[model samples]
Target chain A: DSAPTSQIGPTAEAYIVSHPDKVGEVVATYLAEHPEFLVAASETLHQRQQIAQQQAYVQLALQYRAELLSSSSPSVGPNEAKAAVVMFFDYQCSWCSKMAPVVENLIKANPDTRFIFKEFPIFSSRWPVSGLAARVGEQVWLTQGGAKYLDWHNALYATGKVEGALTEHDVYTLAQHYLTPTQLAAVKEAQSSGAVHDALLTNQALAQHMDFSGTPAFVVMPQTQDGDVKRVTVIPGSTTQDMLQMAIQKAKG
Target chain B: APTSQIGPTAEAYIVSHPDKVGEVVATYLAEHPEFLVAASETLHQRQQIAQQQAYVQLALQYRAELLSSSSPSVGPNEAKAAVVMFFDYQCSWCSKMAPVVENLIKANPDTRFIFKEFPIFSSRWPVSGLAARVGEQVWLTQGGAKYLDWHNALYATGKVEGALTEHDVYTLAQHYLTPTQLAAVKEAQSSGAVHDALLTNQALAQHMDFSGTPAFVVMPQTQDGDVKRVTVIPGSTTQDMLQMAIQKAKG
Candidate 1:
């Protein structure tokens, strides 16, 4: 997530191994370009030479290791959505709830963006019922799926408590348009399933690994790479729509 | 923390720009229910998430062992304040800050300073490997005070970097190390003991997942009766920067 170089990777390394002449040439060019990787100087040109070439791949290794885990968690946008966002959020968080609409606005503003909302309900420790809220959100996605999940989520918009979990019933009443009474009952049954626990546990573990300090943490990835996960800029609080817009554009670079 | 009326405002605008909220639904409705799976987390994606977390978690678990490795250090071991540095001699930036570090040691008498021989360019320079190993060997033989004596002398001779020789090192050592202590360094140099320590240094940096030199980890004392936390500082920074980090760590 910190920083890059040119083709100073395996291809270059293979060449350096073969032709020892370009050792100084390649090393000097690399250090001149990506001087951040510069270490110390050496008496023997051989030592200084290898240092540059080795440092090149070291950065590549750093990049490969920094790849953040991608979520399969039900997100708001298309899989084809150009921009990728991994947000760690709790339903009860006022900031989370506040950012929800803000996030909605940004995604609405930029259809090019893909937003993944992972249910990381930290307040569940203090408010046991809040854990149920995450489970219920997951349950909706599990049983009712993507379409009703929004309808239910939208209905909770007015009733949703920020900085805390959502209350159970009103959203259930709102889920009426999307889910039949039978489907709602089915959701309730499945909400307690291992699937929901597995989902939440995955989110919790991922959050901890990122050193996430609060709710509404967002990782905005650049649109620079394809197939491979690119670098991400983490914004760990409730962000304004413009702030999000700026972040997306900046991350896109 | 920004007040965004955008959420409510966005829906009204969405009435005009239907691409926002309803595109998925519109796509789902117009294109059939295939757009259904896009809204929920998928099984494969969850596994990708798990794999990524485990990867990062694995790197983080190596932190403690890296910091506590049997490396050379300066200052009081039980001083409740410490700074761990992975540095090389030939590094120009390190050479520049060599005196700054010397000053830092003098200023912070109560701090425990640990040096991990991240001699990145050392193998390239005889002096780099020679001086560092000699530095490590002296500490191993004579103790911390003599180590400081050798450490100060090496930095003082900044004039002899490119053209440094074996005799020059011996000259520096003779003034600081006991006759017997000096013999141990030469013997270790011949026996490959110094070489092993340098190898371990490289391995140590790799373990921390850092490849660059002059990496620093500063540990500040805790007030909550908990062990102090480590703060990593990288690059050859200013003395003020280093001092501020140490001061913060001291707190």
Candidate 2:
């Protein structure tokens, strides 16, 4: 876009509404003498456009709070925590693996902070095996709950290499370390079930809604005593612990 | 091929037939990105010409002050053509082109060359102001030939520095003056006459839109031996360009 047009002031709008034909000639006459006003008008319009964009994102985030923080997603820390951090990640992304320890350290440091893990497997478009990893996470979280779900989540990340390096068998073998035989079989069965597929579909849809196109996206929010989220602060890429901490602190206010 | 005034008549036609001309032009420009690019370039070229014309008019208004002032100069004061240079001692482009300008001065003996002190670098380098002020003082007390010698000598020191003190400038000026002349030059430097000449030159430079050093304003002599319309050349220029302007001004 070249530039957004400036919003007409109420006084000017009223005048134009009353005398539309005369207004054009008056504007032409005024701007012919004072061309500097055109530059200032465009600059003000540009600044207002940025503010409008920021407000639009916040309004969208507020509307989708429940879908963003769904209980079906694997999570850690207290549900009654002072703040909540939601992370959208794909297991096939190297930065997601790199960010695994950083998120773990934040959870350890902030006992009163809840974290929701959203499996947004974008790499699945080319590498379907990546989607299988997300499906496995959902199955583990559904059957065995959050504790074992995180255990297998960390193990799945331990392979280090991205999508093609790990096959279905390799991922299953890695899951074997954390899951019992019956539990492992349930995960493998759930991979084909509509429940696991639909659960991940919800996550992918919500990620696109939040304008996330990459792995390791984050949204940190302050929660009230009544468990209502105050506002959403989306950090759209892989981030540092200190930056996350600062965001958390600012969100607290 | 005289063209009648169509300004108001054409405007009335556009205002009454907005859909025919206004909207059509808007849609045409929108569809043609290449046309918009060329239009902008054309507009920019027109703006540059208008601004240069403005600079020439301002220079012509200050022609007497620019020519007959006590700033250091060379050639006959009564020459039929003139070239005025606004320079700072610390300007590297001015320094680099110093020899090119000196050669022009020698080649164009009929053109009176005026050197205006414009220490644009003084806010950062004190030596720049010190050098210009001392040069002005030399012109005031010792006259143009000695001042021109002192000016060339100062530029010959390779580079002027921010760290150079008043004593260093005086030491440099001592080469062009006798002990009696040096005292008068020093007295002139402190008397605030040096400050006035630089300030007037600075004001004139700003008025002509000459924001940087190595700016030249060349003018032809009228039949009455007075300045008429002028030509302004901005920044460091080739000797050939200066000669071409001098020739044009003479014509």
Candidate 3:
């Protein structure tokens, strides 16, 4: 089919490729005169990439299924789940804190859906407390199991005692309230052994591959063959209970 | 490439409005979904080149202001690599970046570092604006040495938001400036020169689409060559990112 302005775009691209020396100055002069085109071009690029990006997301999810919802991952629900909700979250994210209970409610209501929690700490450089919390969280999940891990997670998010960045004392104090002495010892052992660090790194790499912009990102995927990977739905950024519930319904179907 | 069957009038319209070409192409692709199914790879490559050209052009347009703005800077203009950082005093990430940047300043003596005092947190922390103006005034009056002292001292306070107050800014400024210089700084606050400088900085940062503090733009000292790529780190990042860009710019 003949497309509008088809030759113009191709011709411009061809000319730029052919004239490497003149490309910078010519493009700069054009952009300087019509700066509005930059915004329009970027917007058009984003709009055009949406469908292709979604397909890439599905491909990545299918390809990294085992790592995305690992067997040893901190999870709630049956071993043979009909659907899985993978959450990439940071401990210091206020949005992630807000969605923690909503995700918990989803877990309570949807027994058929497995909720795998991944620690993807992005704010650790600014908030040292964040990285420590993730390491502590992974250790908690490893030593105390998913049930107790969820308790610690909720408590860490709910605490009003934090003045700034949720101190290390605050993390351990909450951990003390949740775990026994033996479990706490095991948690620290794993933390000091660098096992928790490895877990966070793995989650970080997986989240990066998925191109998640921020915390509270969810990947709701139904049990389907590789042929039907398009059925997987990715909800990036802060999402509401209804939005997630809708994703769950779609995944179930 | 598909041969254009559109009339001459339509072709002229497209040429006159090259900005709308993106929309026209997008609409055409929407109508012909099969085109993308067969050409996704080619489209992706074309898009990448188009985007690179767009960004490089944008970066080159701002290169002059980014390098020679009235903003305070350290190192020689003759330095091989130059980087512009937009930052706020009260930004925790900026504070975190302070020592890292200071380390870079010491390490990369051949790199010119321009500090764009973009106090985005002025609404939340009034001290940030006060600090920006004071820093600008110091740079304008006392020069880069004293301004660098003021900049580093405020960052060394290791405080932000409520913890870093207006009084603390004065205390830090007092350490660098003599009594006369301190009065000059106080007077310059009302003179509007410093405020105007900040306005320019804010406008320049927004023009570059920098929404956050501690944003960086690294480029070679001069763009007098064919390859004119400027590496822009839009937010707080590891020193490695800045170092690699500096090295790349050096090349």
Candidate 4:
């Protein structure tokens, strides 16, 4: 008990590691006698498990990249984007609404990062409008086509749906002021596309596969140490634009 | 991103990309040219929480795994939410929350509650380590069910008075463990793994950012195998406070 602190840790540990069969009895007698150290040891052990799983965290992020990123997904940034930022969001999710602006600023800020959007509606029961919102997003991009999709996406984020962003009829009527009639029809009939439904399925599968618990989840992928591969980071919650930038850097590792 | 921060391997990254500290820096510098001079200062320049928040992702994921992993968990293996309660046998706050937590677990089959032993009396205090090491030893040998019985038995025994001795806990183990398991339990109590595990629990408490014992982390599984953070409540909380956290996570 009077031994120096430096000698105490290893000396005691060496004794335990050396006698595997007697460990149970030694521990029983030791902890019952030393209640103080037990508490400290318990807290220390709690942290070790957390730090130990870092590799597991990174692995899960990278393993499902094929699904998280859509090969032909609508995206902004150069054709040869070195890295990609994918978002799974629902109109009904407050966090998603919160993220919309930060992400818009992020793409504008980081020109090299490819930005892709997936309409993820997890609260189907609570908000039927989420699915409708997804359909509208699909059609707008599918038919209105080109850069106007960006325009509408920005509009939705700027003016949240709770405040009444574009709807099927609203967008169609608003389109008269913006989109050509044929383009208008495309965004309309887009709801019926086998192409449309299939798009939803792909995003849905990835959300399930990645096991994202909530909306507004993000995936930050950067080139791995092997220039050939990517280091993926799965972010489970909403983050600030600044925080998002740091995450991209973290994935760069 | 830091374009130059690339090498044939991660080991050689900084050597090859001396000009690029990293991508977050590169991105942050690109946007605010005024901070370009201070880019070396790090974003949110000189702010401690900023640095901590900047790298919070893995910190969060690790907590999830610790709770959901096979470690002394009670609930459906696939439960919708997980909570952690860190306790020291010598602490009274932990005692106050014990029965409340037990009833919460009883009522909510869909929730998982995990126990982590942290016997924080003092540096010279002897019994906490023995209690935790022996506790882990018993839990590891017989599994969660018997472990709880031992745990509950300890609470009852601790009430009987006097400094609970090593002999007292050992005898308590005898009631819950079979004669064969007693040997297994004995071997496990001092086993290197058990010793390391108890120490690991202590480390987790220090980093978890919880205010104190009886602190809780209530989280939801966003998808299968995902331990997404909802909220981490620090200090002892009533059922109402705890339930609010659960619903907030569910939302």
lDDT of 1 by residue, A1-253 (tens): 1112222232333443455433434333443444332223224556866666444433432343223325457666666555667667666666666666777677678776777666666754623344445555666776766555655565565565554444556546555555667766875666545244556776676666555634457777653454333344556566677766776776566
Q: Write the per-residue lDDT of candidate 2 for residues B61-176, one digit (tens) a residue.
A: 77788786566788888787889999888788888878888899889988889999898988898778868877877888778888888888788877754545667778888776
Q: Candidates 1 and 2: which is better by lDDT?
A: 2
Structural similarity to truth (TM-score) of each candidate: 0.37, 0.48, 0.44, 0.39
Q: What lDDT score goes with residue B250 in model 3?
A: 86
Q: What is each model's TM-score for chain A?
A: 0.60, 0.70, 0.72, 0.66
For each candidate, report its DockQ versus the true two-chain complex: 0.01, 0.01, 0.07, 0.01
> Tens digit of lDDT per residue, candidate 3, span B22-109?
4444454455544444454455566778766665566678888888747788898678788899999989999999989998989898
Best by lDDT: 3
Prediction 2 global C-alpha lDDT? 0.71
Q: Which whole-number lDDT from 0 to 100 does residue A81 have in model 1?
A: 54
Residue A95 CA displacement from its true place in model 3, Å: 2.5
In model 1, state the lDDT of residue A115: 70
TM-score (C-alpha) between model 3 and the true structure: 0.44
Residues A1-253 of candidate 2: C-alpha lDDT, one tens digit per residue: 1111222222234444455545444444444444454457569989998777656656656667777666767787777666778888877777778888988888788777788888766655623455567767766777777767888888888888665566778778777766678877876787656343665678878877877755457777765423333455667557889988877776666
User: B1-251 in candidate 1: lDDT tens per residue?
Assistant: 23334334433444555433333333333344322232222434655676545433433455454445355666776677677777766666666777888888989898877777665655566666667778877767766777767766776666434556677788988876677766765633434656677677677667665577777766643333222244555566788887876776676
Q: In order, what is each prediction's RMSD in angstroms?
A: 27.7, 17.0, 15.2, 26.0
For all candidates listed, what's the TM-score of chain B alone?
Answer: 0.65, 0.80, 0.75, 0.65
